[PDB]
């Protein structure tokens, strides 16, 4: 039989407003990709017509605004079944394998979608930011909480970055914890935490703190921008299954990442 791979990739967007959870706007998108090995070139020469490639997406209820690949698809309530169009898949794969003859696999966009999200609960990193703006000074507090409830199974957030612009004419940085980095040319501060999870200190609950001395002042609060990626889980809870013989999954990769992930004062 032929080996094949799958990938779910979800992007989470959030916007927090000070400490008020009711005001947090959330939007999660996502993409499903099927991948085929180079061998297929020779395999679809020894075969056509090949065995029908049919799959099912599990927990399809959790998805909204679903756009199936128009060249390859779609012409109950929690499960959806798809029969891929084989002639077009083959046409495509032949085109890409002539174009990149020295490629080990070919990725094919199969599904694009939104994920219904219920506010702060659907957010893997809860954030709340507070600014105290003195005429001659500035106090910044960033509270964060790793939230297992947003994700199918509990896994870490990697390469977490907190970036925030400091207006007003910064001069000195005092009382910083944990250590951060000052960009003087861009007048902005950046914290990096490599790993945030339940296995982290305080169970993913923590605070970034900074104090700034102002040459002019006072500062106007600017949006905190956040970055993180995560491997091993979706936000949706969707999986995939093969239906019918001929094909085997060698790997189903699930991952997610912040897109526009912001927090105002």
């Amino acid at each position: 039989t032929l080996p094949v791979a799958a990938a779910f990739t979800e992007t989470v967007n959030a916007y927090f407003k000070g400490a008020d959870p009711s005001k947090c706007i959330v939007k999660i998108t996502g993409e499903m990709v099927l991948s085929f090995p180079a061998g297929i070139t020779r395999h679809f020469a020894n075969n056509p017509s090949p065995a029908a490639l049919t799959f099912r997406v599990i927990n399809f209820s959790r998805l909204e605004h679903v756009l199936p690949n128009p060249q390859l698809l779609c012409c109950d309530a929690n499960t959806k079944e798809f029969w891929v169009n084989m002639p077009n898949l083959m046409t495509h794969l032949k085109k890409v394998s002539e174009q990149k003859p020295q490629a080990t696999y070919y990725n094919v966009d199969m599904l694009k979608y939104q994920v219904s999200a219920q506010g702060i609960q659907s957010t893997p990193l809860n954030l709340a930011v507070n600014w105290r703006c003195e005429p001659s000074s500035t106090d910044l507090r960033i509270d964060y909480k790793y939230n297992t409830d947003a994700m199918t199974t509990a896994v870490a957030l990697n390469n977490v970055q907190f970036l925030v612009p400091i207006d007003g004419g910064v001069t000195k940085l005092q009382a910083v914890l944990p250590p951060a980095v000052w960009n003087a040319e861009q007048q902005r501060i950046l914290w990096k935490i490599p790993d945030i999870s339940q296995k982290s200190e305080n169970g993913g609950v923590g605070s970034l703190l900074a104090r700034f001395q102002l040459s002019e002042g006072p500062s106007k609060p600017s949006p905190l921008v956040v970055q993180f990626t995560s491997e091993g889980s979706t936000l949706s809870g969707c999986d995939i299954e093969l239906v019918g013989a001929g094909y085997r999954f060698s790997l189903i990769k699930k991952r997610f990442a912040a897109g526009k992930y912001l927090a105002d004062n």
Binding site: A5, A7, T9, Y105
Partner: peptide
């Protein structure tokens, strides 16, 4: 954007 990069799915 490659979801598998750089690891190999068929190994």
């Amino acid at each position: 954007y490659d979801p598998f990069k750089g690891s190999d799915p068929f190994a």
